[PDB]
Amino acid sequence: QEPPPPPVPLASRAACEALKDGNGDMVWPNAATVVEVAAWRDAAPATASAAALPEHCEVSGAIAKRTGIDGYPYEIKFRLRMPAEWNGRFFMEGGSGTNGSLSAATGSIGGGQIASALSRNFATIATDGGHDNAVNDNPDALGTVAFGLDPQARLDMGYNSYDQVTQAGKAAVARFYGRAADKSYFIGCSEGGREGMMLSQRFPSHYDGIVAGAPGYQLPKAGISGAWTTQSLAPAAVGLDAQGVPLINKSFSDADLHLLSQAILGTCDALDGLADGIVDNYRACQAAFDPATAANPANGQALQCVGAKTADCLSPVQVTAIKRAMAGPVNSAGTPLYNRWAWDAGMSGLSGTTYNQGWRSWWLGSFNSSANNAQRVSGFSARSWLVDFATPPEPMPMTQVAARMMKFDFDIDPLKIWATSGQFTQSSMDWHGATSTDLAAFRDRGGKMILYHGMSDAAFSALDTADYYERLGAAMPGAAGFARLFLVPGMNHCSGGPGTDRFDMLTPLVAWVERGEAPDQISAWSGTPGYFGVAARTRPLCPYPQIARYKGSGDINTEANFACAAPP
Ligand SMILES: [Ca+2]
């Protein structure tokens, strides 16, 4: 990487193939880098779901092949694509879930977009985070979360993998093109959004522009919320699963959640000036809505049943349950362990005859099942907390996860995300958390960050991202000059819901970093406009704390008739 280049033309098939082990003398930043593929790829035409891919060099391999203390093989996989015709920009996409998979690495920009970064002639890279869902699938350690049994695999998942992969990709770019990238960009959602915030705090010089959507920047606390919502909803459950755990998925039918959503709309929709099915004034909604006293606007009666349950009311047990779940977990002293959640119409939604599953899948699960299947009851999120974030890890059969969430002790078990034990020398909050508001180094070198978060996200609370942004603004006056937050009413986790959940985040990110154009609004459209009975709906996303306000005339489904403003 330092020695003279191979005597072949740059940005060519020959320069591409010379990157493979034994085909040249490239020095990688990590001496344990093994290139397994270095292949020239012809241009690929556009498809119904993807933009055309230019002719490029594809490089894939692994870093730091080793054996974990669990006896499993571990390595950091990467896939890199460098177009023959390059715009001089470097791009890394974020992960999802607990990672463990290696994407096509064409540079996803999220927001339901058809275009990839590679389709825009970026050089693009992706990683699996340091473990492999096919290899590190341990049936005694809850499946694909099994990497949590190895301390180094935890560190790789928290920060080290993306650091190693960023360095390797930049080194390959400089060799293949003969020059370093002019600017580097990172875009991720969920776990990928946590990765973006981590990079801005831990490795500020890695990327110049960062998009962090629905960022799990306190991901080790998600399982604490999950135990809380599970125990809060259990009194409203009907029936038991095969292990005797109440069926949390039966606590609310789809029709029940739509009643809740409609009551929220009755209380909150017009607080922004327009009864359009979207709660733009989320702060005013949180101050006004209480399902224990709110009305069902369709029958004019209280949402909470006075007597027996009917299709038009929610039982007092249901109302108590969802209120407690939305309040957030606390210890015996009443101290919050995570954050509270915003009431929003995207908890439900109806398009044709299809009820929105995008909110309820996280805490409740699908209603039509005799087993628990929520992410937070027995699913991936609960499993990840036990094996990946609790220290020491707590492997167990998948049949026992839901019962463990039911017996979760909020004075004892939350401490496990701050603890170390034996060879686990860092806590999960140490290696996975990204809570720092010290972004001076990132800002001072020209870094720009766009955050976004759907209000009806049940994985991570949009209000918790807002609280981080408030802390950032207090710690760094003038923070809006380099970091802005775009909350999306009605939107669920990274996509979906009765809101404008689709948007091109890369175009304004490049404009901010390279031309100094801060995003005063970001255009967005609904992927499911049927939620509003219309063919399309476009709206501006507004920088926190602004919200969209109707101008008073014109099509309510047209972005041009809205502007960003402070709440009324
Ligand atoms: Ca409204």
Numbering used by the authors: 36 to 428, 429A, 430 to 603
Give excerpts from the publication.
PETase cleaves BHET to MHET and EG, and the soluble MHET product is further hydrolyzed by MHETase to produce TPA and EG. Overall, the structure of MHETase is most similar to that of FAEs. The structural conservation between the hydrolase domains of MHETase and PETase is striking, and despite the large insertion of ∼240 residues representing the lid domain, residues Ser225, Asp492, and His528 effectively reconstitute the catalytic triad.
A similar Ca2+ binding site was characterized for Aspergillus oryzae FaeB (AoFaeB), wherein it was hypothesized to have a role in stabilizing the lid domain. To examine the effect of calcium binding, a fifth scenario absent of either MHET or Ca2+ was modeled in triplicate 150-ns simulations (the prior four scenarios each include bound Ca2+). In fact, the terminal residues of the lid domain converge to within hydrogen-bonding distance of each other (Tyr252-Ala469, 2.9 Å), creating a compact linkage to the hydrolase domain. The lid domain of MHETase is exceptionally large, as average lid domains in α/β-hydrolases tend to be ∼100 residues, and is more typical of a lid from tannase family members (vide infra). One of the MHETase disulfides is located at the active site, connecting cysteines (Cys224 and Cys529) adjacent to the catalytic residues (Ser225 and His528, respectively), which is conserved in tannase family members.
